[PDB]
Design a protein around this ligand. Structure first.
Ligand SMILES: *[C@@]12=NC3=[C]C([C])=C([C])[C]=C3N([C][C]([O])[C]([O])[C]([O])[C]OP([O])(=O)OP([O])(=O)O[C][C]3O[C](N4[C]=NC5=C4N=[C]N=C5[N])[C]([O])[C]3[O])C1=NC(=O)[N]C2=O
Ligand SMILES: *[C@@]12=NC3=[C]C([C])=C([C])[C]=C3N([C][C]([O])[C]([O])[C]([O])[C]OP([O])(=O)OP([O])(=O)O[C][C]3O[C](N4[C]=NC5=C4N=[C]N=C5[N])[C]([O])[C]3[O])C1=NC(=O)[N]C2=O
Lengths: 148, 148
């Protein structure tokens, strides 16, 4: 059965994997459940978000139906309109390249980035993205760790 | 919360210890952030709840103040009144028997029990209880996974 994971993903399992991941690159610190986190599909074009907890939804002001299927970059514009390769007027291009390259290289990244909520409120997001290997060792997803 | 998840018992740590238990008696399956969690200390009088995740609070409609320091059986009555060794007038007593026995033998139990929310709403609770063994063999904590 899958009664304890209606979201569709064993988030507890990927967090455990990260906790014990060999040679931890960035310092994650304490994550439990109430943490604002999301999971993206690396095996799907533009790494769409395939799971958004809560906390994350509450924080960003977005619903589960508003974020699932989209790339987390929409949080970079006060109107949630962020196209790939484009130039953000309020977010450091440098920062996002660090995130971009780390992701393509399956490398860990931890930065501070300017994000925006649905209503348009700006805020600093202490983000960290750690790739996740599936049952077979291949990196199929990436877990997102957001914090205001 | 501030960073990602500090204030509290090492819940993440027990979830890890639990998934890696090489004696699976019951099947937990995948677990996400929607899973209501509670940690109980079997060595304290009447196995009181020492930790309750927000999902549990949200599910049972009670607050942290209201569930902390108490035995989860309070959920077996629409008014929160459930004294030990007493006959409940709604619940299936076999489910209540099975649970208690399991808990006394430090055995994993998985049932569907009849619970009640703060507002009186009745719900079927897919309850799974797994005790955590100590590095010394002793069982102090027991983790409960509940989902309507
Ligand atoms: C979000 N959380 C979250 C969670 C998870 C699980 C993942 C995988 C990622 C996030 N992110 C990041 C977001 O999804 C995305 O990865 C990020 O926006 C960067 O990637 P992308 O594809 O948007 O990059 P793009 O469009 O190329 O823009 C970069 C920027 O840099 C300039 N650029 C381009 N080539 C360059 C250059 N500068 C210098 N040198 C070269 N060679 C461009 O002009 C662009 O402006 C999350 N994002 C978020 O904001 N918040 C989270 O919580
Ligand atoms: C709750 N979650 C949760 C989480 C965690 C971590 C634990 C450890 C436990 C739970 N539970 C269970 C609850 O706290 C409690 O353990 C459970 O209700 C059983 O224990 P208890 O103390 O209530 O038993 P009691 O009072 O002895 O009553 C048994 C009952 O059965 C009948 N009986 C008694 N002797 C019998 C007999 N029938 C037949 N033969 C004999 N010899 C009587 O009718 C008794 O009244 C959680 N509980 C919950 O409801 N929801 C959760 O999510």
């Amino acid at each position: 059965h899958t009664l304890y994971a209606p979201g569709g993903y064993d988030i507890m399992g990927y967090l455990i994997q990260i906790m014990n991941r060999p040679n931890p690159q960035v310092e994650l610190g304490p994550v439990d459940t109430s943490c604002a986190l999301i999971l993206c599909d690396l095996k799907q074009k533009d790494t769409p978000i395939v799971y958004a907890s809560e906390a994350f939804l509450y924080m960003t002001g977005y619903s589960n139906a508003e974020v699932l299927g989209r790339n987390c970059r929409f949080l970079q514009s006060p109107d949630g309109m962020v196209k790939p390769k484009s130039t953000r007027k309020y977010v450091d291009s440098n920062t996002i390249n660090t995130i971009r390259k780390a992701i393509d290289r399956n490398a860990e990244v931890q930065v501070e980035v300017v994000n925006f909520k649905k209503n348009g409120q700006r805020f600093v997001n202490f983000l960290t993205i750690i790739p996740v290997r599936d049952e077979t060792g291949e990196y199929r997803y990436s877990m997102g760790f957001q914090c205001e």
